[PDB]
UniProtKB/Swiss-Prot annotation:
The gene is pelC. Involved in maceration and soft-rotting of plant tissue. This is Pectate lyase C. One of its GO terms (molecular function) is pectate lyase activity. It comes from the Bacteria. It comes from Dickeya chrysanthemi. GO terms for cellular component: extracellular region. GO terms for biological process: pectin catabolic process. Pathway: Glycan metabolism; pectin degradation; 2-dehydro-3-deoxy-D-gluconate from pectin: step 2/5. Its main location: secreted. It catalyses: Eliminative cleavage of (1->4)-alpha-D-galacturonan to give oligosaccharides with 4-deoxy-alpha-D-galact-4-enuronosyl groups at their non-reducing ends.
Length: 352
């Protein structure tokens, strides 16, 4: 099946002729991918010779725990990450229950990639692009059921005072269709952008069933295109949530917002404000702000906040087939489906 509940339509490496391999470490993954590029005669095949399903059984809790104890010592270390560059035969990286990684996954110019059940946290190298997950010029990518975390904190003396830790899920370039679902993202200052600059506008991204807790900003920082955010649990947002920019369009439905500052806004450009269609969220009118502790702030440049909590534009017909649960149900149940070790469980109406 290729249904991801969002714009990405992929089965990753779970296709016909897929070869399954077990990675017990970061290096194993690197080696497995390199080998997957060679045909029967040892010659290299552009985009990969065969589809892969890599089960990662490694555990790096020691690194994570050491890092959690010395937060400000991470940014200056060398970044660590597996690069999945120009691999298009289809690939899935599934963490085994109990596995953990203190390294990221950087997807570049690939297609049909699925990253699931990975517990990634406290990555070193925030000053040198130490992203947890990066999707660059890569369409049909599905980031599902992962736990991405660090500390929602900025240490003193870091370059640009923004490099204590890098992003959880950055999407940029021609990553035309992407689905980010069932992830448990917590303790992350910059969750993820959708377009690296003002000129990097476009893409159709879906964020569904994610549980955000204690995050500062970018859920996402959207530049153009379309974003469909449904059934997400947004709690303890310390800066801003969905920042719809460069004329992007967003459909924000059936989500639960709580203890959030500027949950839906269009700021920092001073122009080309994006639009949003609000529906089915726990907040239905400004009266609810007080109830769910939703505060708003201004910006030094022209900006637009959804403080009137009204739709400011339109949204095209949602191409795919999805069945959202109610905002209340996500609030009640979501924490038990999002993240690692939930056996890729999905929240259905029957569970409400």
């Amino acid at each position: 099946a290729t249904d991801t509940g969002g714009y990405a339509a992929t089965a990753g490496g779970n296709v016909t002729g897929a070869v399954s391999k077990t990675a017990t470490s970061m290096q194993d993954i690197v080696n497995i991918i390199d080998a997957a590029r060679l045909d029967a005669n040892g010659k290299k095949v552009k985009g990969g010779a065969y589809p892969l399903v890599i089960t990662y059984t490694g555990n790096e809790d020691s690194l994570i725990n050491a890092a959690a104890a010395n937060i400000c010592g991470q940014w200056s270390k060398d970044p660590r990450g597996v690069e999945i560059k120009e691999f298009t035969k289809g690939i899935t990286i599934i963490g085994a229950n109990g596995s953990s990684a203190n390294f990221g996954i950087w997807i570049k110019k690939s297609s049909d990639v699925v990253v699931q059940n990975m517990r990634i946290g406290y990555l070193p190298g925030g000053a040198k692009d130490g992203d947890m997950i990066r999707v660059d010029d890569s369409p049909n990518v599905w980031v599902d059921h992962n736990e991405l975390f660090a500390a929602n904190h900025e240490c003193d003396g870091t370059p640009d005072n923004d490099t204590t830790f890098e992003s959880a899920v950055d999407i940029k370039g021609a990553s035309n269709t992407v689905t980010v679902s069932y992830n448990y993202i917590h303790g992350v200052k910059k969750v993820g952008l959708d377009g690296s600059s003002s000129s990097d506008t476009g893409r159709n991204i879906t964020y569904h069933h994610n549980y955000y807790n204690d995050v500062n900003a970018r859920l996402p920082l959207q530049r153009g295109g379309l974003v469909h955010a449904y059934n997400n649990l947004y709690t303890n947002i310390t800066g801003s949530g969905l920042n719809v920019r460069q004329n992007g369009q967003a459909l924000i439905e059936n989500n639960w917002f709580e203890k959030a500052i500027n949950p839906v806004t269009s700021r920092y450009d001073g122009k080309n404000f994006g639009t949003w269609v609000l529906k089915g969220n726990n907040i239905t009118k400004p009266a609810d702000f007080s109830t769910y502790s939703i505060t708003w702030t201004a910006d030094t440049k022209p900006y637009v906040n959804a403080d009137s909590w009204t739709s400011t534009g339109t949204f095209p017909t949602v191409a795919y087939n999805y069945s959202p649960v109610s905002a209340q149900c996500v609030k009640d149940k979501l924490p038990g489906y999002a993240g690692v070790g939930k056996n890729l469980a999905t929240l259905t109406s029957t569970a409400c």
